[PDB]
Subunit: 333 residues, 3 copies
């Protein structure tokens, strides 16, 4: 009745408020928010990785054992793209190479000097005819950062194999980026895309860098950290084929690009040798590279009667309490 | 009064609905759900590991420094159970070993060929009298996957020492798998079991594999990833001795068993050497192994008056609103 | 009216209950709990680390490549502070060094003996004139724990460079411990303090140890695990300069101090060599050290109208339902 629609000119809004209440609780809260669903947020995941590619550096070929570290194929690994190599260091005495350590007086060679190649003898010494610096005890000779060294251009073409297995324990549901019908031809020719082809396990390094919105040429020079986020948000009421990984790419060391003091990612490690003599020598390496972190996240939902009962009862109580209160507020005013 | 139990034939259900409301809110929601409790979900954990055992491989003994990687005793480590060893590689030119790279025409040796040992010379060469393949520049000779190599049978008997410390910061509560009264005799003789003996820090590899429902013989051959979940769900209202770790075991790379393309877990690393000459050579290793991930999770609860007041008041409002509404629905109908 | 304040002597409490209801819902729940705010708990973080310092050990200088492992500058690394070095091991036969393996009868050399240097020959042999022990096959000679070795005192002075970048994706908000206006002078001279100077990226190892409430002298000897928690809890309604990292320090392997059986943290790894001959030898290392785990956590909040509407409406319904019920309870009693 037109008297029902408007128990008054205000009262037509009684209906309206009810509509919002009905909509919100039975629409967004019950349905869009899938209140009827039981949720698993304790996702269980595993990631294994392999890198394939070859490159020329220092007039030598580099293969996965050369440029990947650490090697164990985890969800976090570095592809070395640039190196400063200091060959055949031995324990001894020598002058620091860098200008920062420049010396003219043995009094200048004390505690105040920045941390460098070793312990200070407190002596001063000639590095070159033009230059004199403080003397240190340690691995000799010291590293020489005085010219930029090139990157491994080829690295853009290396591939990352990601084998990701996830499980939602509550629903005994298991799936992975590698579908059971995946075949050797597929691995050989499939081309990864976050929308077009979510289940190609092979990712091209250069592609990962571009998705993260980075320029390989710059990134390889500075070194950096990229994140490969893999998201499994699955509605198990829907089809098993509807549950697919969602890939997101970003550069995790965002501070680096905005900073003058530290622009990238590098670290130092050494290769250790011994002479037949049994004297000890090593090759020092300063590795610049791209670190990849594979981060997996997920939640899964399935229909279950228990929540459906509790949520719907909650829905009726709420729509009811809402209507009862809107009437009351209206009655006095 | 019998008139109270049934204010009508329907009205006996008024009581019943009240019972469900009373039960649900003051039973499950208040008690079974421990509403009276304050909860810490920000569990703080630490894990350190050590592996002990010896094995024969390649007619040599292997000890923890040989088969465990990485070595730092973290919550994630690999026990190498199978290896393909390529001894004394040097930088140079040579023919790819695998059949996949088979050659008869130098035109066949170009970009299309799968990633392998190095960069292609574009040349073609003889690997053997029977076989001719493409030529590569890199570490030589290339690896030869043409016969299966055996596993380290003994690995089933290696032991894993897990020292796990957890803390619930809110309650200043600290406990670990290693109880304070644990003694050298105990470490020497205690036998781990998830129900029978939760605080033996020593886990037998073979046992871990069986709990994960895996066959060591197969797992060692393919390589794989097992998860050791340690759960600390503690009711601090209960006794400190009631708070014990709950161990769960599974194989994390579930995709592997269901897939033809990639059945396991392996990775490649190298050992680097130099001649007195100063020419560089390395030993290439393809390691198959079991990776163990120790994953710790927990939440802790203690009685606190503040929630007890708020929850119980919430309980009374809810039982009350429920009864008020059930009466109303009944009155009009 | 004084009749309003007290509709009765009890009824003055009707007002009071309303006050608590008003206060709680519109005070603590709406405001102190920032109900008006939209929250991001899916914090995104990255951490890169570098260690700088030199030390004397075994009458040799040790630099970052010597005492830091693993080297890749992650949020988890070890600074080796103590070592038991076993030089030039070769594959062969020899007697176990430790007293635990003491022998007089070849029958004593069987399965029951604890895991040690290798596989048992089942033979018995003389380690020294005074001592006879079981014979093993493996890397020889076996390690000798018979005298305590010193720590690297200097390690207290090493520095940790932490470059931490975080992002709250929801708000497109990015910040790091390294502010954009940070300069070379700053890195050179700034002194870290959790309250006084949260954005100095350089942390002094000894300082980290003291903040964790530990004695370096003891910690370096046993080895241990320290946690560096970095917390980003930011109110984006407030100023961008108000969002600062909060640093917390602790010792994660708490079980260790309370236990006789295992007091610290150590692990074993080896350096591998080859003779020109091509026979294989290695140097075995038992590393004691401090492991640092950088753990980043955060949540961020910003004002948003959508929650403000829903929360405030929720607030009015709750204050209203509360008052309605308190009146009712009063009317019958
Ligand atoms: N552990 C540390 N203690 C003190 N200063 C450090 C430390 N690690 C890095 N720094 C300084 O912070 C700045 C940026 O470091 P970053 O590694 O990003 O650049 P870098 O030039 O590769 O550093 P370096 O070559 O000195 O190792 C440099 O001035 C570096 O000396
Ligand atoms: N980074 C990668 N790029 C391209 N293909 C890869 C990569 N990593 C692995 N694959 C391929 O995926 C398949 C399964 O890899 P998996 O490592 O499980 O087996 P595998 O035979 O040990 O691999 P391989 O011996 O070639 O390193 C193989 O055909 C392998 O060549
Ligand atoms: N994987 C393991 N299997 C059996 N026992 C172990 C294992 N790891 C450690 N233990 C034992 O637990 C005790 C404490 O180990 P911890 O490493 O803390 O001290 P440790 O003396 O350095 O050990 P070790 O020197 O024997 O490697 C020791 O008795 C040690 O033998
Ligand atoms: O609130 C998180 C929850 O709902 C979200 O809802 C989105 C909706 O999907 C969009 O269409 C748009 O209307 O904005 C809404 C925010 O209120 C998201 O769907 C998702 O984050 C989550 O399920
Ligand atoms: O809902 C999660 C919460 O309660 C759970 O309740 C279980 C109960 O323990 C079982 O006896 C059975 O009745 O199923 C209930 C599910 O509603 C669990 O106890 C636990 O996951 C958690 O505390
Ligand atoms: O309840 C967690 C939530 O509120 C907390 O409130 C604290 C308050 O900050 C203190 O002043 C004191 O009154 O104890 C309250 C606990 O009810 C905290 O502020 C914080 O953990 C969080 O925001
Ligand atoms: C990547 O590989 C393709 C061949 O598939 C080649 O054409 C291209 O030049 C390579 N890019 C780089 C940077 O080496
Ligand atoms: C492989 O299985 C998936 C499972 O959903 C399916 O979507 C896909 O079409 C299948 N591929 C082929 C070639 O049948
Ligand atoms: C080993 O020989 C090198 C030069 O060939 C020399 O520097 C060193 O002193 C020798 N080692 C010993 C222990 O004499
Ligand atoms: C494991 O060790 C026991 C001795 O305690 C031995 O009897 C058994 O044969 C071993 N198993 C394997 C697979 O080596
Ligand atoms: C060691 O302490 C725990 C602490 O709860 C106790 O359960 C156990 O019985 C104790 N063991 C012995 C041998 O007293
Ligand atoms: C080192 O000797 C090996 C063979 O003994 C040879 O292949 C290599 O060319 C030599 N290195 C140099 C730099 O001459
Ligand atoms: C740490 O360095 C300072 C110099 O800045 C020195 O005075 C002090 O003795 C050093 N401490 C240790 C333990 O070496
Ligand atoms: C650097 O920027 C931060 C940003 O909040 C500010 O707090 C600080 O005062 C600035 N430092 C200088 C020297 O201006
Ligand atoms: C290498 O020489 C060492 C001693 O110099 C000897 O122990 C070993 O048997 C030799 N290797 C071979 C394969 O003969
Ligand atoms: Na530098
Ligand atoms: Na595909
Ligand atoms: Na292969
Ligand atoms: Na026990
Ligand atoms: Na020992
Ligand atoms: Na500062």
């Amino acid at each position: 009745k037109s008297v029902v629609v408007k128990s008054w000119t205000i009262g037509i809004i009684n209906r309206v408020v009810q509509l919002l209440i009905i909509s919100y609780f039975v629409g967004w809260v019950f349905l869009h928010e899938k209140a009827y669903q039981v949720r698993d947020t304790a996702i269980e995941s595993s990631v294994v990785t392999k890198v394939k590619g070859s490159g020329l550096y220092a007039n030598r070929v580099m293969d996965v054992s050369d440029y990947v570290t650490p090697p164990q194929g985890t969800s976090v690994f570095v592809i070395i793209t640039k190196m400063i190599v200091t060959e055949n260091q031995m324990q001894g005495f020598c002058p620091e190479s860098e200008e920062k350590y420049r010396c003219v007086s043995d009094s200048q060679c004390g505690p105040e000097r920045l941390p460098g190649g070793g312990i200070l003898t407190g002596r001063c010494v000639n590095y070159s005819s033009v230059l004199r610096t403080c003397e240190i005890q340690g691995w000799c000779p010291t590293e020489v950062d005085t010219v930029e060294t090139p990157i491994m251009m080829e690295a853009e073409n290396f591939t990352i194999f990601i084998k990701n297995s996830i499980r939602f324990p509550l629903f005994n549901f298991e799936k992975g980026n590698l579908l059971p019908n995946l075949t050797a031809r597929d691995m050989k020719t499939c081309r990864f895309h976050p929308d077009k082809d979510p289940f190609c396990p092979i990712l091209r390094v250069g592609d990962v860098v571009k998705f993260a919105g980075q320029d390989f040429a710059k990134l390889a020079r500075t070194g950096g950290v990229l994140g490969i986020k893999i998201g499994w948000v699955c509605d198990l009421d829907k089809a098993w084929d509807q549950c697919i990984p969602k890939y997101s790419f970003t550069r995790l060391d965002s501070v680096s690009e905005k900073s003058s003091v530290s622009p990238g990612y590098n670290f130092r490690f050494a290769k250790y040798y011994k002479m037949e003599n049994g004297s000890e020598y090593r090759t020092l390496l300063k590795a610049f590279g791209i670190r990849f972190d594979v981060l997996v996240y997920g939640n899964a939902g399935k229909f279950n009667i228990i929540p459906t009962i509790i949520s719907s009862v909650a829905a009726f109580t709420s729509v009811g309490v809402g209507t009862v209160l809107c009437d009351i507020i209206l009655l006095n005013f």
